[PDB]
Design a binder for this molecule. Structure first.
Ligand SMILES: CCCCCCCCCCCCCCCCCC(=O)OC[C@H](COP(=O)([O-])OCC[N+](C)(C)C)OC(=O)CCCCCCCCCCCCCCCCC
Ligand SMILES: CCCCCCCCCCCCCCCCCCCC(=O)O[C@H](COC(=O)CCCCCCCCCCCCCC)COP(=O)(O)OCCN
Lengths: 56, 98, 430, 49
C-alpha cells in the first residue's frame, strides 16, 4: 500500500538509516580520537621518561 | 554535481566512435546480438575505461607504426632497385675488383 | 533486528514476583528489581544505583541464572543495556559489584552466552564488551579466550544470523578499541576469521563492521606488521571496487591510511605500497579523488594515500630496482617495467657494465621459457629501443633482433603481443 | 543495489499542467503523429486520432 501510513513508515526508515550513518561516523571518529590521544600521551610520557631516566 | 561523470561518459563515447570509424574504414563488419545489458551501477566504469583505453591506444599505435614502417619499406625497396640497376650498369667490363 | 528485539523486550514487562513466590530468586533481589523498574527517572535510577550498586548486579545475576524463562532474562538485559546507553559510566556499578563479589564479572555471564535466546546472548555479550571497554579490567585468561571463541563461533555462524553477527562485530570493535585486546585478537586466529567473513561476501552492515575492525586493528604497528601474512589488501581493494557505500569507502580508505602510516618499517611500508599498486588501487584512488565528497576526512585520506602511492611508485621506478630485478630474474610486470619516466631517463644506464644489462636481457629472451618472463624481456627491449635510438645498433650486434623476431611467432599470445610491439619499435627507423 | 532502506514514492496534489499522453499503438502511431503535427492536444481533451 502507498497510503500515508506507508509513506510515514518509509520516511521513518530513512530517518533511522541517516541516524545510523551519523552514529557510525561518530563511532569511527571517536576511535580515531582515542588512538590519537593514546599516541600523543605515549609520546609525551616517553619524552619525560627520558629526563627521569637520565637523572636517576 | 555529476558533470564529471557525464564528461567521462562523453569521452568514452568518443573513444567508441573512433574505434567504430576505424571498423568502418576496414572491411570488418559490426555484429548485432540484440541484448541490452544495463550499465553497471558499481564502479565498473574503471574497467570499461581501461578496456576502451587499450582498444584505442593499441589501434593508434598500430596505425602510426604501420604508416612509419610502410614508409620505410617503400624507401628500402626503392634503394634495392637502385642498387640492382647500378650493378647492372656497372657490368660493361668490370676487370678491376675495386 | 537487534533494535526491534530490544523494543519488544522493553515493551513486554514480566512481573518478577513469580520468582519470589517460587523461591527461585532472593527476596532482596526481587525488591531491588521492582524498585529499579518503578524508578525510571534518571535521578531516581542514579540514587538507587548508588544505594545498591552491588545489590543491583547481584539481583540481576541471580534472577538471570535461576529463571529459565527467557522473558525475565530479556527484560534484565534490556534494562542493563538501556542504563549503559544512557550513561556508559554506569559500568562502574557492575565493576564495584564484581569487586565486592571478589570475582570477575565475566564468569557470571560466560555460561549465559550459551542461553537459548539468541537475543539474550547478544545482549549479554554487548554488556560484557561495554563493561570491558569502559572499565579498568582488561579481560584475559581462560574466560577471555572462551569469550573470543564464542565471538568466533557467532561469526562462523554467518538475516537474523546477519544481525547477530553485526552485534558480535560491534562488541568486537568495542573490545579491539583497547590496546591489549588488539594484541589478544591478533594472537588469536581472529584475523583469519575476519578475512573469511569478508570472503563470504556478507551484507553491507557486516562488511562495514569488518572493515571497521580491520581499521582498528591496523592502528597498532605490531598488528599491522603481523597481519601482512593474511594479505588483506587484495580483498579490501576488491570490496572497495565492487561496493559503493560511502561508509565502506571511507572505512577502507582510513584502513589504507593506517596501514601506510603506522607501519613499523619502511620495508613493510614499501611492501604494502607495492601490494596496493599491483592490486591497482592507484586508479581507484584517482577516480575517488576526481569524485567529490563532503567530509574532509575522506578527502584527506584520499590525498594521503595518493601521495604515499606515488612516492612508492617512484621508489620502485628507481633504476636500481630495475637492475636488481634484472639480476634476480624478476620480470613480472613491475611498475618500473612500464614507468615512462624511468625508461625515458634511464635507458642509457642499460648499457652499464659493458652492456651487461643488454646481455642479460638477450640471454633471458633466448633461454627463458616462462611466457611472463619472455613478454617482460621483450617489452623491456622495446622500451630501451624506443627511449634510446642509439641502442638499435647495439641490439642488432647482440642479435636481439633475431630473437625478438623468432619470439614474435611464439606459442603464448601474451608473449607474442609484446614481441610484436618490440619488433615494431626496433624497426621503426633505419 | 543491496541497500536495506527502501526507496519511497509519494503522490501530491498539484497545479502544474500535466502532459498529453495517448498510449500510441503501432497502427495508430501514424494517425497520432498526423494529428499531433498541428499541436499536441491539451491534458485530457477529446483526442481527434
Ligand atoms: C508506387 C507508388 C504508390 C504511391 C505511394 C505514395 C502515395 C503518395 C502519398 C504519400 C505521402 C507520404 C507522407 C505521409 C506519411 C508520413 C506521416 C507519418 O505517419 O509520419 C509522421 C511524421 C514522420 O514521423 P516521425 O519521425 O515524426 O515519427 C515520430 C517520431 N517521434 C515520436 C520520435 C518524434 O511526423 C510528422 O512530422 C507529422 C507530419 C507529417 C506530414 C507529412 C508531410 C508530407 C511528407 C511528404 C513525403 C515525401 C513525398 C513522397 C515522395 C515519394 C518518393 C520517394
Ligand atoms: C475496399 C472496400 C472497403 C474499404 C473500406 C474499409 C477499409 C477498412 C480499413 C481497415 C482495415 C485495415 C486495418 C489494419 C490492418 C493491419 C493491422 C495492424 C496491426 C493491428 O492489429 O492493429 C491493431 C489495431 O486494430 C486493427 O488493426 C483494426 C482491425 C479491425 C478493424 C475493423 C474495421 C474495418 C473497416 C470496417 C469493416 C469493413 C468494411 C468493408 C467491407 C492494434 O495494433 P497491434 O496490437 O497489432 O500493434 C502491435 C504493436 N503495438
Amino acid at each position: 500500500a502507498l497510503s500515508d501510513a506507508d509513506v510515514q513508515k518509509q520516511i521513518k526508515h530513512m530517518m533511522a538509516f541517516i541516524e545510523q550513518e551519523a552514529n557510525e561516523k561518530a563511532e569511527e571518529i571517536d576511535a580515531k580520537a582515542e588512538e590519537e590521544f593514546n599516541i600523543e600521551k605515549g609520546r609525551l610520557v616517553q619524552t619525560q621518561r627520558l629526563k627521569i631516566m637520565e637523572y636517576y | 554535481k555529476f558533470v564529471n561523470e557525464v564528461r567521462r561518459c562523453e569521452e568514452m563515447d568518443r573513444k567508441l566512435r573512433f574505434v567504430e570509424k576505424e571498423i568502418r574504414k576496414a572491411n570488418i563488419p559490426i555484429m548485432d546480438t540484440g541484448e541490452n545489458p544495463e550499465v553497471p551501477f558499481p564502479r565498473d566504469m574503471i574497467d570499461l575505461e581501461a578496456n576502451f583505453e587499450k582498444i584505442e591506444n593499441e589501434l593508434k599505435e598500430i596505425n602510426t607504426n604501420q604508416e612509419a614502417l610502410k614508409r620505410n619499406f617503400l624507401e628500402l625497396t626503392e634503394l634495392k632497385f637502385i642498387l640492382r640497376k647500378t650493378q647492372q650498369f656497372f657490368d660493361e667490363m668490370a676487370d678491376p675488383d675495386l | 533486528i537487534i533494535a526491534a528485539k530490544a523494543a519488544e523486550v522493553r515493551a513486554n514487562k514480566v512481573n518478577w514476583q513469580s520468582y519470589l513466590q517460587g523461591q527461585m530468586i532472593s527476596a532482596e533481589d526481587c525488591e531491588f528489581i521492582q524498585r529499579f523498574e518503578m524508578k525510571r527517572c534518571s535521578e531516581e535510577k542514579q540514587e538507587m544505583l548508588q544505594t545498591e550498586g552491588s545489590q543491583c548486579a547481584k539481583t540481576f545475576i541471580n534472577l538471570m541464572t535461576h529463571i529459565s524463562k527467557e522473558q525475565t532474562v530479556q527484560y534484565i538485559l534490556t534494562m542493563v543495556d538501556d542504563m549503559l546507553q544512557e550513561n556508559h559510566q554506569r559500568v562502574s556499578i557492575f565493576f564495584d559489584y564484581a569487586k565486592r563479589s571478589k570475582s570477575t564479572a565475566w564468569p557470571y555471564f560466560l555460561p549465559m552466552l550459551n542461553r537459548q535466546d539468541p537475543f539474550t546472548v547478544h545482549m549479554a555479550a554487548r554488556i560484557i564488551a561495554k563493561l570491558a571497554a569502559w572499565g579498568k579490567e582488561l579481560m584475559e585468561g581462560s574466560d577471555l579466550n572462551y569469550y573470543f571463541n564464542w565471538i568466533k563461533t557467532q561469526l562462523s555462524s554467518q538475516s537474523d544470523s546477519s544481525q547477530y553477527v553485526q552485534c558480535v562485530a560491534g562488541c568486537l570493535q568495542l573490545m579491539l578499541r583497547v590496546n591489549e585486546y588488539r594484541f589478544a585478537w591478533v594472537e588469536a586466529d581472529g584475523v583469519n576469521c575476519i578475512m573469511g567473513v569478508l570472503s563470504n561476501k556478507c551484507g553491507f552492515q557486516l562488511q562495514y563492521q569488518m572493515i571497521f575492525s580491520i581499521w582498528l586493528l591496523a592502528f597498532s604497528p605490531q598488528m599491522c606488521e603481523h597481519l601482512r601474512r593474511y594479505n588483506i589488501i587484495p580483498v579490501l581493494s576488491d570490496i572497495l571496487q565492487e561496493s559503493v557505500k560511502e561508509k565502506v569507502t571511507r572505512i577502507i580508505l582510513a584502513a589504507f591510511r593506517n596501514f601506510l602510516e603506522k607501519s613499523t618499517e619502511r620495508e613493510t611500508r614499501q611492501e604494502y605500497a607495492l601490494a596496493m599498486i599491483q592490486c591497482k588501487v592507484l586508479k581507484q584512488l584517482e577516480n575517488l579523488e576526481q569524485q567529490k565528497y563532503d567530509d574532509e576526512d575522506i578527502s584527506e585520506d584520499i590525498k594521503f594515500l595518493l601521495e604515499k602511492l606515488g612516492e612508492s611508485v617512484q621508489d620502485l621506478s628507481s633504476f636500481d630496482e630495475y637492475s636488481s630485478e634484472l639480476k634476480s630474474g624478476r620480470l613480472e610486470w613491475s611498475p618500473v617495467h612500464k614507468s615512462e619516466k624511468f625508461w625515458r631517463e634511464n635507458a642509457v644506464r642499460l648499457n652499464e657494465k659493458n652492456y651487461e644489462l643488454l646481455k642479460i636481457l638477450t640471454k633471458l629472451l633466448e633461454v627463458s621459457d616462462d611466457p611472463q618472463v619472455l613478454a617482460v624481456a621483450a617489452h623491456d627491449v622495446g622500451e630501451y629501443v624506443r627511449h634510446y635510438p642509439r641502442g638499435k645498433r647495439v641490439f642488432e650486434q647482440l642479435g636481439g633482433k633475431q630473437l625478438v623476431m623468432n619470439h614474435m611467432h611464439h606459442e603464448d599470445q601474451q608473449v607474442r603481443y609484446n614481441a610484436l610491439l618490440a619488433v615494431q619499435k626496433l624497426m621503426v627507423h633505419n | 543495489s543491496g541497500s536495506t532502506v527502501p526507496s519511497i514514492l509519494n503522490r501530491m496534489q498539484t497545479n502544474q499542467t500535466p502532459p498529453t499522453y495517448n498510449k500510441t499503438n503501432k497502427f495508430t502511431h501514424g494517425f497520432q503523429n498526423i494529428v499531433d503535427a498541428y499541436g499536441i492536444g491539451t491534458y485530457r481533451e477529446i483526442n481527434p486520432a
